[PDB]
Design a binder for these strands. Sequence first.
RNA 1: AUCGAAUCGCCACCUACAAGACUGGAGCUUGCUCCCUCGAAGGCGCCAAGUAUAUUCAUGAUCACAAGACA
RNA 2: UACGUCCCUCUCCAAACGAGAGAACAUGCAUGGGCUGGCAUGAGCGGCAUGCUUUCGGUGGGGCUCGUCCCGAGGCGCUGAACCUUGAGGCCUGAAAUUUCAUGCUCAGGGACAC
RNA 3: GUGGGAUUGUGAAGGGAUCUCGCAGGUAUCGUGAGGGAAGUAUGGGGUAGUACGAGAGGAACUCCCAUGCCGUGCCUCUAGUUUCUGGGGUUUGUCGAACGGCAAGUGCCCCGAAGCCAUCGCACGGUGGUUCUCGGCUGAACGCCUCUAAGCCAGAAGCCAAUCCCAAGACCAGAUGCCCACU
RNA 4: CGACGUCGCUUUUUGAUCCUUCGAUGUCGGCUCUUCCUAACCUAGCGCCGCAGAAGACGCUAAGGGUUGGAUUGUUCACCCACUGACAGGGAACGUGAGCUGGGUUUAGACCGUCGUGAGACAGGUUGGUUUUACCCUACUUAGCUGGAAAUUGCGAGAAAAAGAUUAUCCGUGCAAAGCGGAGGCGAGCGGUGGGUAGUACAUGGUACGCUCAUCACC
RNA 5: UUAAUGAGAUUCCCUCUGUCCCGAGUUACUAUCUAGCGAAACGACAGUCAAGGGAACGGACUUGAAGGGCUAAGCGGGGA
RNA 6: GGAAGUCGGCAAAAUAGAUGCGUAAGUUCGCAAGAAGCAUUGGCUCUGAGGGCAA
RNA 7: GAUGUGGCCUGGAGGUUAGGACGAAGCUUAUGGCGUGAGCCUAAGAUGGACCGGCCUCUAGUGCAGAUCUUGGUUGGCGUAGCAAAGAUCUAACGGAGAUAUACUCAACAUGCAACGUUGGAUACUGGAGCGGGGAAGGAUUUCGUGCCAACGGCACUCGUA
RNA 8: UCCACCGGCCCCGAAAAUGGAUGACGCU
RNA 9: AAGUUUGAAAAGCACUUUGGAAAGAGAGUGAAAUAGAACCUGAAGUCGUGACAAAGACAAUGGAAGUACCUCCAUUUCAAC
Lengths: 180, 399
Amino acid sequence: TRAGMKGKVLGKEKKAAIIDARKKAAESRKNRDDKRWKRVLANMDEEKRKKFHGVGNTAKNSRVRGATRASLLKRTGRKPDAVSMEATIHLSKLLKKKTFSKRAPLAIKRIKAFVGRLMKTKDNRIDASLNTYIWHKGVKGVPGRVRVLIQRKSEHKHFYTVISNVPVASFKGLTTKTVE
Amino acid sequence: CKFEHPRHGHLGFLPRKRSRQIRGRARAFPKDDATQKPHLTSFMVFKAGMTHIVRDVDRPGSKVNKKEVVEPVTILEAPPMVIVGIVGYRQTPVGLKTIGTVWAHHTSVEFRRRYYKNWKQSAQLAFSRQKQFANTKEGKVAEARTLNAFAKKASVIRVIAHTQLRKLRNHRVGVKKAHVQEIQVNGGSVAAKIALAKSLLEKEVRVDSVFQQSEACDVCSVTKGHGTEGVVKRWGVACLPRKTHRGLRKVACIGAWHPARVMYTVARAGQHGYHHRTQLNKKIYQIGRSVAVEPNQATTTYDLTAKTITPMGGFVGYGTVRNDYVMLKGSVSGPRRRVMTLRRPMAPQTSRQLKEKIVLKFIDTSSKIGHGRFQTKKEKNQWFGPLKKDRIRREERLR
RNA sequence: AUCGAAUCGCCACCUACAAGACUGGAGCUUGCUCCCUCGAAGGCGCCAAGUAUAUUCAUGAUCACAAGACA
RNA sequence: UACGUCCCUCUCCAAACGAGAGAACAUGCAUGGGCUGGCAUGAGCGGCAUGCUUUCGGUGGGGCUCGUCCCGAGGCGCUGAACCUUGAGGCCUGAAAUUUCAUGCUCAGGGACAC
RNA sequence: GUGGGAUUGUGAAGGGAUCUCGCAGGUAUCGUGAGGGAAGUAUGGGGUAGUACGAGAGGAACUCCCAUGCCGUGCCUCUAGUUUCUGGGGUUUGUCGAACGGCAAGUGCCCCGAAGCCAUCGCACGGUGGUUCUCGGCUGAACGCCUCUAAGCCAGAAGCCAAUCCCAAGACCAGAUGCCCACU
RNA sequence: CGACGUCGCUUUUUGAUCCUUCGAUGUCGGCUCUUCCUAACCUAGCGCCGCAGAAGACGCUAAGGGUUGGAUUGUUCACCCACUGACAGGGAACGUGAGCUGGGUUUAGACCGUCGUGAGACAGGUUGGUUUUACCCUACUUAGCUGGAAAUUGCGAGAAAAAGAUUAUCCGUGCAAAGCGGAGGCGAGCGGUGGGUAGUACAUGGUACGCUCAUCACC
RNA sequence: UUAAUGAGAUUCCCUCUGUCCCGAGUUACUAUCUAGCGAAACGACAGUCAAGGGAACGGACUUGAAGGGCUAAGCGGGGA
RNA sequence: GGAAGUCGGCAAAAUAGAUGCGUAAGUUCGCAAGAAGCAUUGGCUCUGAGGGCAA
RNA sequence: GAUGUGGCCUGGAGGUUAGGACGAAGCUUAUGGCGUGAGCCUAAGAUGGACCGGCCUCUAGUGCAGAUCUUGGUUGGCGUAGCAAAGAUCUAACGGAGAUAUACUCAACAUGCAACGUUGGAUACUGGAGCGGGGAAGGAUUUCGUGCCAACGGCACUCGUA
RNA sequence: UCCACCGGCCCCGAAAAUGGAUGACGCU
RNA sequence: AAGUUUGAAAAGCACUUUGGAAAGAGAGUGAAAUAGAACCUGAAGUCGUGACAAAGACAAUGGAAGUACCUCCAUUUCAAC
Ligand SMILES: [K+]
Ligand SMILES: [Mg+2]
Ligand SMILES: [Mg+2]
Ligand SMILES: [Mg+2]
Ligand SMILES: [Mg+2]
Ligand SMILES: [Mg+2]
Ligand SMILES: [Mg+2]
Ligand SMILES: [Mg+2]
Ligand SMILES: [Mg+2]
Ligand SMILES: [Mg+2]
Ligand SMILES: [Mg+2]
Ligand SMILES: [Mg+2]
Ligand SMILES: [Mg+2]
Ligand SMILES: [Mg+2]
Ligand SMILES: [Mg+2]
Ligand SMILES: [Mg+2]
Ligand SMILES: [Mg+2]
Ligand SMILES: [Mg+2]
Ligand SMILES: [Mg+2]
Ligand SMILES: [Mg+2]
Ligand SMILES: [Mg+2]
Ligand SMILES: [Mg+2]
Ligand SMILES: [Mg+2]
Ligand SMILES: [Mg+2]
Ligand SMILES: [Mg+2]
Ligand SMILES: [Mg+2]
Ligand SMILES: [Mg+2]
Ligand SMILES: [Mg+2]
Ligand SMILES: [Mg+2]
Ligand SMILES: [Mg+2]
Ligand SMILES: [Mg+2]
Ligand SMILES: [Mg+2]
Ligand SMILES: [Mg+2]
Ligand SMILES: [Mg+2]
Ligand SMILES: [Mg+2]
Ligand SMILES: [Mg+2]
Ligand code: NA
Ligand code: NA
Ligand code: NA
Ligand code: NA
Ligand code: NA
Ligand code: NA
Ligand code: NA
Ligand code: NA
């Protein structure tokens, strides 16, 4: 980042103070607009009120007009050193039109990269079950989807992941979950 | 003493280099007529996609007179622009020089992000000192002096306009920093131009205030890019016979012995596409309102079905047209999502075709994914009826 | 703040303009006569702020980039 | 010194590589759901029955055992079903909807210049 | 002056001295437009009209306006081509004991196939002012008269030049701007 | 249009010469592609005819644009079919072979005719007969980075700028007018950013606006 | 003169087709970028043009006109 | 569209197995001949025919 | 093309004079001086380590820029052309110096990459006219075990017909 | 004043292929 | 092809340190390790590095005259000179 935003230059306190200042500015704008739009909508007529659609956060199945979605995210804090999640990877979207004799090794590399980005880990080990599942229709017959179990662990502190196959009958309706 | 044919390509579009900018920029404006009312001459739009229309033709003598025709059209989304500044130009023996800029008292975040590579992590100081200064009495005097200089020395007045990407709530147009262009004010005296521009300051301008429905416009845009291309595609030269040693898709002779060098008129491989073009005489077939105000965008007097300008499944790679838009007859240079400039026409608008009043009878809104055969989702629903998944949904509803 | 320099005419009167087969003005006789601002100077500047009763200059020693220069 | 710029990172209107357009905790990315579309009716099971559809309707040229229950390409039903649908990179979380999106990941961005 | 470096090759440690370099610009937009490139070009039909001319046979052209060649620049709505989305089916031989899932035949082969790319195989768009030639005139001498020229003028070609269009500041733009810094 | 005479011009023919190249400048045609010329076929204007009209002849300015598809032939030339507004003529190392192609030509094999006693010959016919190399420089096409006006240096100062105690000692307007109008501190003014509140406006999440408390600056 | 035979030479017809009109799309391996490895040919000196003369076709000479430096991918006009 | 390409159908496309039917000129009577052409072939469930040993 | 030169230079010989460990020859030079020049001479080596200069005469395999010159070395091109037939590898554990290799800040990503041999598992190929199992010719220790990776195995190696 | 004839300078006669050459600019 | 021609003696670099090793940094021997092993001298050419000179594009080199800056060079002068 730029010099005036570097962690090692500002230090913890100043970085936190600048961060809270930006947040409180955005928050002041959000609350002012919230109050202004609520009262302006209230003192308006039914023809106009319906004319205005979901401005003052009135419509259902909508975002919050006031702020960003990420600013509404509750930051639970530090994830533990040891953590396990189950996730689908859409492999065919990554392997489309790839040379047929490269499909399975490419799938291994794409899975390693996917998990490494997810877990901030460069040591990403493939369990025998996942490698067997990926290769079980030969080099060019990689399945379009795979459900993997990701287990990060520690042994400075060194983090590595173990990725194993999760056999599933269907992929429909499966999202990413945390497993203990 | 040989067989003869014309050369390949137009030497007036040289060099075939990548355009300096991605935005379409007018290199000239229409001749200024002081007898007309002051008016803006340009507007920035975004290409969403294409469809086709049916209309009846009013052209006596033609074999299609009083007959239906179908025309492909291009849909360009036109959210309103915001006027943020005034610039004046004085004429000198070495060309136009700008006298100065009168900035608005308040600018959008979108306009100010245009001054940054990384806005979110920046100090965000753009125009802060200017605001604090112009707000005062010395700043008010400096603004008055700049405006008086415009009145005294300017022959040309332009406004600084920028686009609103927040209102263009498009998910594939990733850019959040506003596009900025100078829009020339034509018509009236210089004082009248300055008055119109001063009234326009910090205000929103809609595309229907610059253009009218049945008129034509010129389009400044950059063409789709293809990277490095060979002479066959880039220039249209013939392919060589199958028997040719070392390759067929090339120019056999790139020159005579003398001059003992290669001329600039010989076709070579290189950049193709991503060029700026000006593309005059595009007829405006419709200036639509945003769907949140008028949702029956594609409804005509002959097709009463309520539908929007967005085809079933959306414009491919673009999404929904959420704002005001312009329906242009035919095609325009450049891909979807690319910002383009509509300019008031420079060619004479006195032909029968260019004056013709356009009345649309049908606007196709079928799916642009795969041979769309339904105009609306209700038409598809009444073709298929209850499917299995709808029955499951109702089964869940009853429990 | 390096930095020592080469350059030696200033101006708020030239720093507007046009014509050279007609240049200040007339006349009728049209190339001569009569009038004038009389047709060939941009203003200063060159050692007393002004034309005179003055007043410090050395030895920087007989040439040397003027050893000095906001006129 | 400060603004800031670039690299790492992410996207694709760019693209041989440079360069470009962008983003910088952002519905940004991921995975689901819905839409839009493609193909053409999946596996399994079954034959007037606890099956299918809402009172109806329910095979097969032949063949084999002891009227029944077996083998049999194919057919019918559940079933416009099953699967695929963004990826070099379709749509929807900002018009309305018999439904019109849901979730979870990010937890002080790192580095170098500017100097 | 300030700072940072360094001298020539035979040890070490301190002193000078002398060189050299930095000491003011960065970064982000909008524009100008000198110079260069340069592009549109043909045919037909309607009507004029079966008329002007002509004994008659025969037999025209422009205002206009309707198309079409070629060339040029693009585009992908449609139609067409293309498929390693090996998408969904189907089908042969072999093969995992069978069904299933498939797999091998360097994409097995066959039908259909989105997206993208793409065809005068599809669709869109292609503009205005000067200045002259050849030549015809006006006024008008030389030279009474005359004369188109000799001094002046006028009209004037798909020519030339500029506009529009493409690149564009080594064309070094004291063009205008945003923000830091330096100067102040 | 032009006898018989006479004067030119041009290097798109062939001859004449033998100056360059024999320690090698790839050799016909076609294909592809670009450019140039005009002695103009078509396209634009204009004169003139024996010019009634239509069709044409001849000339002038004009080279901006255009000038095809095929049968036989290695062919260039030709001449036949057809289209067309027209199917003009030339140059570029008889443009163009590390661009191709290799039909012809021009080695070695072989057949014929003629010639020769013969080996063999033919300026005659016939058939078969390796087409090599670019990663260097320039040129051209695209594609990046980057100094620089004393074209790197001098400190060597020139604005298609303003107009004044010599640009200092205010701001506006006006003709480079005449004048005319504003311009130790506290408080005030004017504003930038935050609280409270109140409509409204704009395309409607996000800015502006009236009142008050806070701070900040400049005056 | 000859049936049969022929990787012999020639002409025509049916079929067929990207040979062509007139090109377009896809694949593998390259080129391309990276790690490791790493040559040769060739090499007077060098490389922007116009005209002129000149051993009668100059990169150097005369007179003009251009030319900021350094680079990546190509390309076959010239380097007779 | 179908050789208009090209010196020249070069290259490529095309034909295709098996079975039945059918097959010209010419001829050294052997051939020509797979001349040319026409048709049929899957999967299932069956039926027929084609044998050997012993009393 | 001819000729001259108390003209220059080199290896040896007869003479005569000198020099050298307090530094000969050789070699280096912004290292000056002298000569029209061939060259000579000095200086300095922060060079060297043992021979050698001048002058007269004698003598010769006696002076180089080029011969598609001979031999050796170097060199731009150039980190370039390229190392593309024979389809192909993946995964864990073990072994190994071959790593999880770090200044401050820093939880891990964004600061040690890339590559190995063995075993297990997976995937594929050869497809009996075989990268199967044995012989002649030819080769002659390449066979086997242990060890070891300097060179060689046009990349790599912990492996090897080294 | 016009008739013929003869000089000077200028003009016509006077068309080629990369953009170009009294050496260049220019000179009346 | 190829002189082993280190040095007077092998006195052929113990020992420390880090590196897997090769080696590096120290320390020793020696008059001298630019005498460290096929090691005397160690040229040219080519290359690296530090300091400096600058320098558009006139290919570079070259001539002649100056000038700016340098000069581990030579020579001369330094007072009745
Ligand atoms: K490499
Ligand atoms: Mg693209
Ligand atoms: Mg060939
Ligand atoms: Mg002086
Ligand atoms: Mg990509
Ligand atoms: Mg909605
Ligand atoms: Mg398609
Ligand atoms: Mg397979
Ligand atoms: Mg030669
Ligand atoms: Mg040669
Ligand atoms: Mg040659
Ligand atoms: Mg060749
Ligand atoms: Mg060839
Ligand atoms: Mg042959
Ligand atoms: Mg034969
Ligand atoms: Mg044969
Ligand atoms: Mg083709
Ligand atoms: Mg290459
Ligand atoms: Mg030349
Ligand atoms: Mg030469
Ligand atoms: Mg070449
Ligand atoms: Mg033919
Ligand atoms: Mg032909
Ligand atoms: Mg063939
Ligand atoms: Mg017969
Ligand atoms: Mg026959
Ligand atoms: Mg048959
Ligand atoms: Mg001689
Ligand atoms: Mg000897
Ligand atoms: Mg000799
Ligand atoms: Mg010689
Ligand atoms: Mg390479
Ligand atoms: Mg196999
Ligand atoms: Mg074998
Ligand atoms: Mg190796
Ligand atoms: Mg002269
Ligand atoms: Na120009
Ligand atoms: Na299609
Ligand atoms: Na198809
Ligand atoms: Na005979
Ligand atoms: Na190159
Ligand atoms: Na020599
Ligand atoms: Na390779
Ligand atoms: Na010692």
